RNA sequence: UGGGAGAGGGUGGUGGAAUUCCCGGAGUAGCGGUGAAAUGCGCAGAUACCGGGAGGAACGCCGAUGGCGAAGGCAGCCACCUGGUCCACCCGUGACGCUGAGGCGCGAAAGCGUGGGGAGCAAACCGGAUUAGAUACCCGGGUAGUCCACGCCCUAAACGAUGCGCGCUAGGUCUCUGGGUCUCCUGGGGGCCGAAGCUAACGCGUUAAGCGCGCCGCCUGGGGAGUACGGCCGCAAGGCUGAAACUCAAAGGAAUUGACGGGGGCCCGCACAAGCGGUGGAGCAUGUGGUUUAAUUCGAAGCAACGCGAAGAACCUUAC
């Protein structure tokens, strides 16, 4: 990656909620290019969110998003003898990464035997704002915070 | 914009003309450069020894302090 | 408890101390990076020269201090960050004065500066 | 004769900054240091801040590619003493000149003697780190020394790696220092680029490494070795003069093409990074190393050998 910057590719927008973020969503679910059955995990969790705290699936989601979505992160960076780890802002891109992979991860964790009560249950903590999806945008901007000294190291 | 050049006559000699010699001490009492003063090498030489003797003279600081 | 004094800013590379002093130059208080919590080379950070001279900055409205003289003695890279966290500590900077005492010429340096 | 510049030198003074230490005040939990860190110092009150004092050393700005000196070297300012040098006058003498074996004197720094002084720095040394080790590089201390007087030492990348004196041979430019008649010319120094020329080349080039002349020193391959011996000097360290045996067939200088670089610049590649998924874990397939039997046929050895030759070993194949 030298050249050019290698462009974010669109993705098109999923046939229910018409959103390329939720297709976006999708594909952190998606395994050996499974998409069908990652889409309907999915929309199973749409249902169960749509049934546990019945609201708009979509509204819940991009709230759960947005209280997980960092903005500060460190960078290793081996200046001198020392591996330091810069704190850094993030682009809206690398923060919806970091924040659809969390969401995915920390429901990847969770007890519930199903993937789709995992989402679920990943949704309705990170819309409102706790789980360890939150915990680790918690965590990773404390931890940015924690090396705010090094910010000048930043490149 | 030499600093002589804003000057009529005056004796580089004369230590006890503090206020034109006060012309050629820096903002932080530092003596100027030549290119600040435009004074020949005799006559900067003229200038600093001088100006030396107004400092021990008391007449001119040996040093300021910078005021952001 | 004064509102008018002066605040001294010693700004090194391995470290940024600020002391808050009364016009009669008796110090009021003081802080260094090691104070705002750091070790080793985080005290010279500009950041934690920064945040040395805001606990300092509060320390003086600690006693009312309102505004003070910026006294600056040092050459590190924390001293201009400093300025700022003085600035913006509700503290009216009035005097910002370099006093990094440079000799003329002086004694021999250590071997670090040759 | 009249002038000029100068860190030229000796002596005697004397100004401030800064450090350090002490004292007094205020004040607290760190300071300091490093790549990081640690030693260390600090609560018995440090650092940071202020006032006062003591003391030692060195002279920021000017400052310069500048100046001075034969060289070493010389830099706060004052005064005294003193040297060298340049300019103009063309006044005086009238070859009185140059070099220069020895001798004489000077000669950075380190070092030594004595005595004094001793702030900071800092050999030696101690400790902390780093390291595999670290007798170092970095940090904390730290003594001689570093400063003075006098007396020694006499070496140096004491280098312009370029002995001196003189003459001639385009120029341009910058710079300092004088004179003039101030466009400019005339001089004395200090750099830069360059004619001719010279140069092995690099480069030198009116400040020659050109052309010439006079005088002195010096070289005759490398090492052995600036050592041995001897001699002189030295308090000492050691210095000066200065071999040979033996040994090598080169040691060298400059520059070219590359290569390399824990040099630089600029670019680039799933090289890193952002991701995803893996191996190494387990069992098995298979290849291989090594062991083992009659034999484990043979080959490929980093990438670029190893599910490769072998896109088909029960006999064949097959080479054992």
Known sequence: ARRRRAEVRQLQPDLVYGDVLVTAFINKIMRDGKKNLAARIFYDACKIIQEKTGQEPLKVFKQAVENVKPRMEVRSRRVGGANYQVPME??????????????????????????????????????????????????????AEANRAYAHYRW | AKVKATLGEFDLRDYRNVE????????????????????????????????????????????????? | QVASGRAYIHASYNNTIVTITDPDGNPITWSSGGVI?????????????????????????????????????????????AIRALQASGLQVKSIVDDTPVPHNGCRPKKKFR
Do not use: C
């Not at chain 2, 100027?32 to 021990?56: M, N, V, W, Y």
């Open chain 3, 37 to 81: 919590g750091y070790k080793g080379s985080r005290k010279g950070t500009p950041y934690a020269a920064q945040l040395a001279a805001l606990d300092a900055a509060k320390k003086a409205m600690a006693y009312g201090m309102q505004s003070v003289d910026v006294i600056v003695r040092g050459t590190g890279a924390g001293r201009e960050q």
């Open chain 2, 20 to 68: 034109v010699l006060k012309r050629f001490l820096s903002e932080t009492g530092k003596i100027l450069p030549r290119r600040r003063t435009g004074l020949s090498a005799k006559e900067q030489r003229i200038l600093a020894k001088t100006i030396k003797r107004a400092r021990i003279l008391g007449l001119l600081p040996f040093t300021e302090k910078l005021v952001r």
């Open chain 1, 90 to 143: 993030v682009s809206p891109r690398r923060q919806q990464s970091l924040a659809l992979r969390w969401l995915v991860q920390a429901a990847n964790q969770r007890p519930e035997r199903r993937a789709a009560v995992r989402i679920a249950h990943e949704l309705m903590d990170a819309a409102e704002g706790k789980g360890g999806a939150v915990k680790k945008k918690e965590d990773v901007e404390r931890m």
